[PDB]
Design a protein around this nucleic acid. Sequence first.
DNA 1: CGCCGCGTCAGACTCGTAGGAGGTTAAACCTTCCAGCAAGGGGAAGGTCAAGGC
DNA 2: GCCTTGACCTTCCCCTTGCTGGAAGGTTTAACCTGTGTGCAGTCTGACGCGGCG
Lengths: 50, 235, 130
Amino acid sequence: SVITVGPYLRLHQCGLPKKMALELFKPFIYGKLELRGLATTIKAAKKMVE
Amino acid sequence: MVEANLRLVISIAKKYTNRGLQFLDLIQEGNIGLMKAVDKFEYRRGYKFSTYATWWIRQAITRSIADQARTIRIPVHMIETINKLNRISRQMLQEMGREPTPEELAERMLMPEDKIRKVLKIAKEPISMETPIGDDEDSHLGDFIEDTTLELPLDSATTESLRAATHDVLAGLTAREAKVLRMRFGIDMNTDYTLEEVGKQFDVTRERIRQIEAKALRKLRHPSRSEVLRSFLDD
Amino acid sequence: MNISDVAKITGLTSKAIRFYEEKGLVTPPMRSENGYRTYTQQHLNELTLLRQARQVGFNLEESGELVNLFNDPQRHSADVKRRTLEKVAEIERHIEELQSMRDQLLALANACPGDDSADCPIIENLSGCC
DNA sequence: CGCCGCGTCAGACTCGTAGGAGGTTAAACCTTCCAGCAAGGGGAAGGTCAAGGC
DNA sequence: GCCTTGACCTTCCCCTTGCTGGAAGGTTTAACCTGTGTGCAGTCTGACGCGGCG
Ligand SMILES: [Cu+2]
């Protein structure tokens, strides 16, 4: 991505646009949906995710 | 006699090294040309040997151009079709000032459309995996290719999950039906048995075997257990 | 002989001759080493016999039997003519029943008004309804 | 021996931009293999329509 | 739930006229004609080897 400034940050933190992370932590989430019984499977999980 | 006439041979090969393949191989087929021309020769006719030889040589090379010169094999018949096609095309270009139409040269050649179609579909040659598609040597065409062959890890895990849910359900149905259906559909082994063979393993029945299949369907139909596959409904 | 010259002499084509040889309907012509079917005056007249046999009406089988007749110089003109006459009879039956059919068609069609109608009486005579 | 010349090898990183070719060189005579048509007809092998006996 | 039990269907291969068309694959013609090239490639260049050559 492009970068800009967080002039309030606690430097060990970083800025981040969400949707990037939404792709990037995806199968994690799939497993966790299956774990919580919400979406017991993967296309169920994916449909909820979309 | 081999060493008599080599210079006509190279003359013709360079007259036809209008860029089909390459110099030397052509020249060498011409040398075989000259061999068989001499190896059978009729002297009684009283002409010059060389012309007899000449057209024999022409045929040898004008074959070997067309057999090879493509990693795809297109035997000769299609080749001369393409040749005469273009021999007509040049004159259509003049007397039209414009490119041809399939129907028009089909009429002039008196032969039908779909041949022309599949010809022009087939007439063209391959384009070199590492061509420079970039502006500069940015990256060649290789990057722009997909491995559209193997798997999806998503669908792989999904299929594992299908299997897990399915045998979990098979535990929930009759040992007889579940086992006999694992083998009747070939699950849990390599090969797929059929109606009578599964029978005469088990016992002679045929139609109550069918009705055992319908039984297991009723046991499975059961809108409480579908939900492990009611999403695989959509699989 | 030259196979095209032979097929034009008998009017047929080469695959016709080959079909007949496949059906064992003549003397076997040899090949040459290059593979040219060595026909003959024997095959000339066998093929002309087998040619007019079916134009007359003798099928692949009975015309093969006619070339058997020719290749049999022991042949008996009687059985030849008896089969000629059995053929006459079969053609007669064919003629008679084809004309019975014709007569039925004509009774259908002249019975039709041809009044460009949904009321086509022919078809409803043909169809088992109503 | 101490030049003179020739000959090989090297020549930052990451993103994306566009889809892309072209001109020409026998004809006849033969060979073998199969697709396909009417107009359907036999026939194998799974089935599948009812129906019984405990 | 063990058995057929009879009798019906659907599919799939294979067969019976008289050929026909297609595809792939072969072999010979007597007037002749005798050493390319054909567009490069614009010379990058400093360090370093080594061949010949004094
Ligand atoms: Cu009518």
